[PDB]
Amino acid sequence: VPVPVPVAVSGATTAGLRAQAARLAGHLRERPALGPEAVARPLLLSRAQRERRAVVVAADRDSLLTGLDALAGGEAGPRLASGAADVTGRVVLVFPGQGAHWTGVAERLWREAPVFADSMARCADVLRDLAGWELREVLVDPVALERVDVLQPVSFAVVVSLAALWASVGVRPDAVVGHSQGEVAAAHVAGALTLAEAARIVVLRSALIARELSGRGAMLTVVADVERVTALLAGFEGRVCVAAVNGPASVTVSGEDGAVREFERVLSARRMLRWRLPGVDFAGHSPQVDALRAELLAALGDIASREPEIPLLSTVTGEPATRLDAEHWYRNLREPVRFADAVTALLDRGHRVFVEVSPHPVLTTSVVDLAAPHRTAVVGTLRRDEGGLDRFLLSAAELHVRGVPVDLARHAGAGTAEV
Template sequence: MPLTPTVPPPPPWLLMFSAADRDALTDSARTAAELLADGAPPEAALPARLLSAGHDTERLAVAAAETAGLVEGLSFFADGLPSPRWVSGRADGAAARTAWCFGGHGSQWPGMGRALLNWAPEAAKVLRELDVLLPNGVIEPLLSAADGELGPPDTTQPLIFAVQVATAHWLWSLGLRPEAVVGHSLGEVAAAHVAGALTLEDAARVVAVRSRLLAKAGGGGAMATVNLDRHTVARRCEQVPGTVVVAAHSAPRQTVVTGESEATRALVSALEAEGVRCRLIRINAASHSPFVDSVLPQLRAELADLAPATPRVPWVSTVDADPDPVGLATADYWARNLRRPVRFTQAVSTLARRGIRAYVEIGPHPVLIPPIRETLRAEGVDDPLVIASGQRQTPESVSLLRLLGALYCRGLEIPALEGYVHAEVTTATDQMPPTHRADRG
């Protein structure tokens, strides 16, 4: 049976335009904004006929939950003002090869996943399956989470994982496929499933065991991001009384530290006093540190019978020095995943050197976008596309349409987009711009 929405979902719209040059694109946006501001419904902007935009054209996409938001996005673009409601680009083919990236703890927010349940049938189907597979369920926690923290790792991390894989299945339903996948810490479980190494059932089992044992080993630990290179941070960790270590190499100048709560906060305070930007991560555990050593034997034992398949999609590891190791997704691999520092910048560098210029972070809220961009700059990648599927306090229906629009702007034609919209692609510059309405659910 379909899920009954607790609150009617907003009616998100996606408007997509193409033109031969920026001036023509600006004129189309301004004309559409004036039309909608005068009271016309978005569908009134549908062209008499649709023409393929082809490639090597200027493109614009505007996504919003209401007509006023569309007018704002169109007007801001036409006036040269930044806004999260619009994205533009040249259809240069960058989006043809896209890496899907899955973040770890810290992306959660109360209200995440609700629009997926109400709006995206393929995502809702996966969430219903996970509601049975995960010990604490999925649907009730997502619908009932109040403002504030969602809870300890064994409560929060399965929900992050659920939103990640449900979103990935929705993208699959549109015919989208990644060129490669990469995960940061917890995010590797979703990456393993999307790569084809683990079934949904096995991936749910891994995240349940991993998060439960991490909560058991928490002991009041803390984590924080530090905007310094990992070598400098490692030296500073050694100068702090107590135990604090490097937990992740996220970017050339972004490092995650973890350890005893008091020691971690002392390091952060000392660095902030020197002008170094730091941010505490919302977790009371110390993964990727000696504090999890006590639970690793149990993790290996509980997952000993895992029989992962050979990945169908390239999965770049953030655990081992070799980004393409053997033995991915085994019990021993997940023990290393929980204990070793995360080699995320190594993974992104590997993808960049393989020619990938488009990176989609899949999850409730972006936590990987800044480190991805920093790593790509260090690798000299020209004009990459870096976009997220979710945004805190933004319904997934809107943020997902914004993602599709960003991919479209960089040349991707989305095979099954007509299932979520009234019209398919773009128009010539002498046509009224096409309007797309997300009306399924």
């Protein structure tokens, strides 16, 4: 099977970029034996990367030529990224909460990307000791993944490992932020927790949720701002509460299933958009969590932690994180998620590049909403049913075309073919 490479072209203008695409396609059509793997490296390392940039991520001629023809003709394509190389400022890795996972994610990337494979095997080691089960086996098991005690640790391993893959192409965070469950991964990636200790927290906390909360609640995201959602919760006091504030158009609420379904009727009547968080069978960030507190502090005990090597913006406080002790990890389950606040604090400190480290983008539209009016690059990593190295490289290309430093040449091969 051919391997995907990022094939880069650029111009001083959009019409210059389009003409360069057409010229490359013509060159390839004059040379029938010439593949993307022959030309990709010199296009990156031997050509200026100008103001208007595109990348076609392609493993074979035909798919490269399809991308290039689309680019030349001003059309979008499924493995074509293009943009203005105009973004400057610091880089944030965002780790999302539960609801982005899709069954089968990470298996293909384990086969295709040795840095990701490695991280995933380091995770499997730590999770084997703790949870018994074998990470790679569980990745493809839809029945196991519905269980919160399996899903949360698998999700943690996947996003830690995607972060390692980003680092291998030279995209390292200046700051991190993790929404609810993602805060543990963010803390690890920030250097505040070992892999082992982070994993212990996710494993012990997720097993306790599964025992005490699973089946007794649900969580719902509403396309609306928190002022509006709070108005609509009149009469739902103590039954459905605000659990997260993600942006001006994304607020999540939490409660017992019946009560949430009553609230959905309020929203429906009013033509408001909403959806249940998939795979979430508990009322996170609600008073239901009070009863877990004692067993959680006991199971966690003393946390082995250290000062983060880069800033970790907590979604407990919306501010740089203090002690990451057991009480912190309880509050990361109990208290409303201040995601919008955390992202806003980063925007106000010159962060302009946001990489959601996830199987599928769930918080990117909120980051885009919050960032306005600043010039920013906001990308995800994988998408539902697109778990290949090709999709990862397309995400890396989406940064490159906005002028963010990324080492696409790491995956560009060993080509020496020119012009």
